[PDB]
Amino acid sequence: EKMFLHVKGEIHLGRFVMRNRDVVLTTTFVDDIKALPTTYEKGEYFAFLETYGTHYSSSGSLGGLYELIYVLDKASMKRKGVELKDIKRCLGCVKVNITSENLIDDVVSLIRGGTRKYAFELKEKLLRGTVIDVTDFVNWASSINDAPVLISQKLSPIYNLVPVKMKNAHLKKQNLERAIEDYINEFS
Amino acid sequence: SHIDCRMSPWSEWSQCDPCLRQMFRSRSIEVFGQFNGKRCTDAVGDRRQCVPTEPCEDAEDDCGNDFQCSTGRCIKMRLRCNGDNDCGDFSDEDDCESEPRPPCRDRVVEESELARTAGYGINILGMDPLSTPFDNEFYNGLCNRDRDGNTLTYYRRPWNVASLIYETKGEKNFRTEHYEEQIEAFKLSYSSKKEKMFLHVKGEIHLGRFVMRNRDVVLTTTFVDDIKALPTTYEKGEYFAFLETYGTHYSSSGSLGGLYELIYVLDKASMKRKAVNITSENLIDDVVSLIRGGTRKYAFELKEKLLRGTVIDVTDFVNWASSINDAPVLISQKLSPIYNLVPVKMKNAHLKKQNLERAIEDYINEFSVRKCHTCQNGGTVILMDGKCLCACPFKFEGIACEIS
Amino acid sequence: SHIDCRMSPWSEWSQCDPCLRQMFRSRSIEVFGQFNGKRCTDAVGDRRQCVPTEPCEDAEDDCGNDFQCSTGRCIKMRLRCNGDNDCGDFSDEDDCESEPRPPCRDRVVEESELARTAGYGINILGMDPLSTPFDNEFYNGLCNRDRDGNTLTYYRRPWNVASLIYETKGEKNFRTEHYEEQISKKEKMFLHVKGEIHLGRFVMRNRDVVLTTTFVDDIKALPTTYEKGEYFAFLETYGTHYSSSGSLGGLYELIYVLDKASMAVNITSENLIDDVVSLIRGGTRKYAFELKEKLLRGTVIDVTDFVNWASSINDAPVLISQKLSPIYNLVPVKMKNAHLKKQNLERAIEDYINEFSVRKCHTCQNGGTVILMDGKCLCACPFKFEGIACEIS
Amino acid sequence: DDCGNDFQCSTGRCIKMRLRCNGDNDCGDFSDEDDCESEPRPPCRDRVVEESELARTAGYGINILGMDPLSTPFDNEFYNGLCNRDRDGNTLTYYRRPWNVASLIYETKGEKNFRTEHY
Ligand SMILES: *[C@@H]1O[C@H](CO)[C@@H](O)[C@H](O)[C@H]1NC(C)=O
Ligand SMILES: *[C@@H]1O[C@H](CO)[C@@H](O)[C@H](O)[C@H]1NC(C)=O
């Protein structure tokens, strides 16, 4: 045997893209660069690289998302009274009472953004082994306006933000590259 | 096995740019990564400050008989008193209090929200749209008193959108396609069946269409200034950085609107023969929906309904069709290279155009999927941020479709 | 298989145009890209600035005794001092102080939007009703009162429109055709429906045209020397043609098609196919985007939905069909080198006819045929052939 | 450091002299805006706008399988004294775009997939 069922959804609110020159940083970020030594002071450069970030998203996507993999092997329920089209129909039915039954168990939840009330209601219905109603998804979708999450991102390393006016600018950027290169070996 | 990042370093260093007080470098990316081996995040080009080795030239670039705007734009002088915003700074209009009048005398009129976002920048990396290189706030003193759109009420068309129109066209398509096949024999008893489904649906709700004026174009102060910063010297990764963050192209053709689409693909097989007892079953199922444009309350309400056996309520479509008034998406367009907007009447502009085209060719060649390794079995190569890979909804598995 | 973009070299530089202060050459597309190879974009005309090699001529181009408006467009004093603002930049307050009232002495009258959009430009690429070359807000100082269209209310008709006759037509054309055969059994269906409503027809005046300040001044800006890029830029921003007349209205069209067959030893087979489509244009959104959906389903329609949809065409028409006139007929003589502009607009349109030819793209596989799109020659095919070149099934 | 004819900021920045009076918090805690009350000239000509909460957090600092607890290295409270604006189609409200964010496009797009393969 091999078997899986997936349900996946996107809610997309907007695209952001950002500058690569004439950038204005927070003063607290360029202060953290002005405090770096001229030397490859690896412990301090790893301190900075976790005091703001290793990379940044030169662009991303504001929204919300779900992935709800049914690890459930169909035959775990399909031996009892439900056809393949009927279990589908119940997930999105009279042949058993699947919403009352202990039969649906192994559905995973990943849910991103929106107000906790609605995210919880979707999660609670899924772990009980029950489908969400279309009412529930539109209520969730309305709430992503208050609480977005990044669905996907396109990435660049943080040393690109270091201003060209910085005393020892190229040396610091080259030492941040030397530090970024070590992370890949620091973690197995 | 999967493939991590490969590159070679700068191998060059510019002299100091006199007016810009800076120097540049750019490096050869070989392979960003394949099959989820680790990304090349490191920079395609970088720059360093220099105290310049010679004087800068005369910095002014005055267009002459045109007014040199406080933004650095250029325009016909008289408009600077008219209540049109010519300048990219309203207070140049505030300055000339002596001849204030708007471009229309008695008209009561709206801003076209379709015209404001007309001429999006685009990046070929995903056909991402980007905010307009174009100004779209200036009227060129033209009254241009249109009344298109479903409310039949006046709007003014800003100087860059030569055409903008609000055409009310729709189309919808349906296909549902089904097969069943059976083979059975005896000598040993053998039986088998196959079942197939295909669906396509789409529907288009057009709102409008546009074209951008290819001469005397009026640009965002930022775009016309963000040409000034350019190296003049074909520093590959720097012209790549402008192409990355104002886009490879700017466009003008429109289908603005809402759109929906669906597919089902289902394909199913079962086989048995019969002491000896042998059997197999194979089945692939896939169903997908898309919605774009309109407001959340109705467009997100529709998106899931489309997949189901559920017959959709016609007034839900009518509420969506109304909401596309507020929230269009660009369904189709005509691309034009971004360099056509670096204007005449600015220093070294042709050399800046030459470098922008060569950097578009570099954009085309370094993202080229021809560099990546062959996908296995029935698949074909896919590109994503920092990696090549492939995937196959067709009885194949793994990040290169290696196995079945 | 997939094919990439290809172009000529860049032609040798023009000399410096004296008044335009620029110099260019061009680059022909050979192949736009085909079958999802790397699609073309890159420019066919591009230009460099020059400090000119000789003097520009005297810049004024006034039509003699005519009034020199702030547009620099040729007009006569009756058009300005009667308050009508014909000359293109609302200047009339400068011209007269005593009784400058509009030509409709007391009986001042509304305009029409369906009239204003008359003489849309059109382009063989995309066939778009580009916004008017004509300045339909010029009225030639005429009061010119229609009372036509279904709003049962008066309107002033624009100078460049000979008439906007609301010559109404509503036509439904319908066909069905079906067959059955048995020995095995076969069943076949075709359905076609179209409905057309013509609200009216506009005709553009064939002499004495008033063009938009932008159209006339954007031909003043031409090279004078046969350079593709600036001529193509005028084409691509104003049309290859103007609609010298056309029909405003709405349209719907539908199809359904079905084709069905059915046919120790145990052998059998079944075959089926389905194809359904709907189109709507014109009318206000609520009714149109009801009806285009509504008619794709079998639903026996409320006649009041047809009445509401097609009533709304009075407020929101689409151009059903029109008479194309080659665009250069709109360079008004009594302008400097006016005919040399005509000549090279025609030569640039002939150059348009050269590179956008699909015929030179490579053959699609199996039962297919080639189409051209923005940077791709491509095909789509019968008999379940597949991929953008139809090489497989 | 030394902004020349332009203005040197409290926690170390340069603000162009035209910015300082406008109302935009050019230099942190409104420390740009000490006294210019004779010429407080706005970026927008009395247009209604509210500050984009969806973009003020954009440009998050990122780690390999992680993201920052403190909002950004970029300063999304900076606007170059421009008024350039995007809008929410859902409430019809206009927002200024932070000058870090080269583009905001607000798009309503919903995509949903169900899938199984079985053997
Ligand atoms: C095959 O499986 C069926 C299941 O009912 C069983 O009855 C039959 O005896 C099996 N045949 C064999 C043993 O090959
Ligand atoms: C028909 O199907 C049966 C199923 O067992 C098979 O045994 C037989 O060979 C096929 N031919 C006949 C019976 O027509």
Ligand SMILES: *[C@@H]1O[C@H](CO)[C@@H](O)[C@H](O)[C@@H]1O
């Ligand atoms: C001359 O034309 C060539 C094409 O052969 C270009 O590559 C070059 O940039 C220049 O325009």
Ligand SMILES: [Ca+2]
């Ligand atoms: Ca002005």
